[PDB]
Point group: C2
Chain length 146, copies 2
């Protein structure tokens, strides 16, 4: 309290805060997506396909930095739920949204919003903006040395 | 891409990048990145009921059981009696300075390009966000 006003900081706090927000996020998102029969482990893949559809399953793995075996199980449940399909292309597989998956998008993006909204409570626009900006740089700082 | 939507994604990517990073730094101790958070909480509070670890970290029971079981196999924790309290072994206790250095090294990397004032605003903001999300649990 005097330590923080004096400038000193828990150099562990950044990583701790992030791990917790992530886990809280997975719980909050998790409950909201259950009704679509989707686990919070599948959400990140679905959200990626909405940006870049028809991506190779290995690419999905490397970008999200989720392992091949976790990736395989996630994509498999997404297929069994009928939200995506796989296509072998002239070995490995490319994954695509089905119509069912495409029509889900407004719901997914809205769920992600309600979560951000919960996180930003008490922040105004300038403040939301520069924290999102700082989170972008923090990530590129990791990404450099990854 | 909306700010509200993207803050989730940014946090998720930082998390996963953190685990891969921590994961590599702690590999010489035979520790997985999944057990790391349990070890850290024990540094704050030794001899806690296992479900209390689970509740606090908000990692579910199976994930917790497997992680604890590995830390026991690895010799870093033991259990005493279901209701088990988990304690650090001496070998677990010795690792603490290294674990804290490694976590703080990840922090430094994330903040590497910021001036002092950006670091303070960021931290302050994270605390607020942290509490906002804690209330919703």
């Amino acid at each position: 309290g005097i330590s923080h006003a004096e400038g000193l900081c828990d150099k562990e706090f950044i990583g701790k805060a992030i791990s917790y927000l992530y886990r809280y996020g997975q719980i909050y998102i998790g409950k909201k997506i259950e009704p679509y029969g989707i686990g919070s482990g599948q959400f990140p893949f679905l959200m990626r396909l909405y940006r870049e559809d028809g991506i190779n399953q290995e690419s999905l793995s490397d970008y999200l930095k989720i392992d091949k075996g976790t990736t395989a199980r996630a994509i498999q449940k997404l297929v069994d739920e009928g939200y995506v399909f796989r296509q072998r292309d002239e070995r490995s597989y490319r994954v695509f949204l089905t119509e069912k998956g495409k029509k889900l998008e407004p719901d997914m993006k809205k769920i992600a919003s309600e979560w951000g909204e919960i996180l930003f409570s008490s922040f105004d626009d300038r403040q939301r903006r520069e924290i999102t900006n700082s989170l972008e740089i923090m990530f590129e700082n990791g990404l450099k040395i990854m």
